[PDB]
């Protein structure tokens, strides 16, 4: 009956492991999904200058 305890412990241990890594991905990933976009937007607006600059160097 002690072998039973441990076998049963493992189950739960693996279930919880599963659940934590599986949950971890959602949570972690969605900050990636958010920030990547969020550095884009910062650029998007103010973005003229790069082209303007680059054009000046190559143009002559």
């Amino acid at each position: 009956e002690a072998e039973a305890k441990a076998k049963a412990l493992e189950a739960q241990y693996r279930e919880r492991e599963r659940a934590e890594t599986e949950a971890l991905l959602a949570r972690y990933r969605e900050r990636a999904e958010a920030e990547a976009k969020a550095v884009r937007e910062k650029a998007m607006a103010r973005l003229d200058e790069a082209v303007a600059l680059v054009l000046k160097e190559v143009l002559p």
């Binding site: 441990a6 412990l9 493992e10 241990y13 693996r14 890594t21």
Partner: protein, 62 residues
């Protein structure tokens, strides 16, 4: 008689040293199992615990 009394009395006092002995020869078995068992449930807390912490770390690290 009192003669047969001494033989009774001897035999019984010997009997009780066998029976108590018998208990002790059991008691160690009983308590051995208990000790063994403790080492089984604990040792399996250990391995599985590593399989937890390390699982989450690499998951975060990934």
């Amino acid at each position: 008689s009192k003669l047969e009394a001494i033989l009774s009395q001897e035999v019984e006092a010997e009997i009780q040293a066998l029976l108590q002995e018998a208990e002790a020869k059991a008691e160690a078995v009983k308590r051995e199992a208990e000790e063994k068992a403790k080492a089984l449930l604990q040792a399996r807390e250990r391995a599985l615990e590593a399989q937890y912490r390390a699982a989450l770390r690499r998951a975060e690290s990934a």
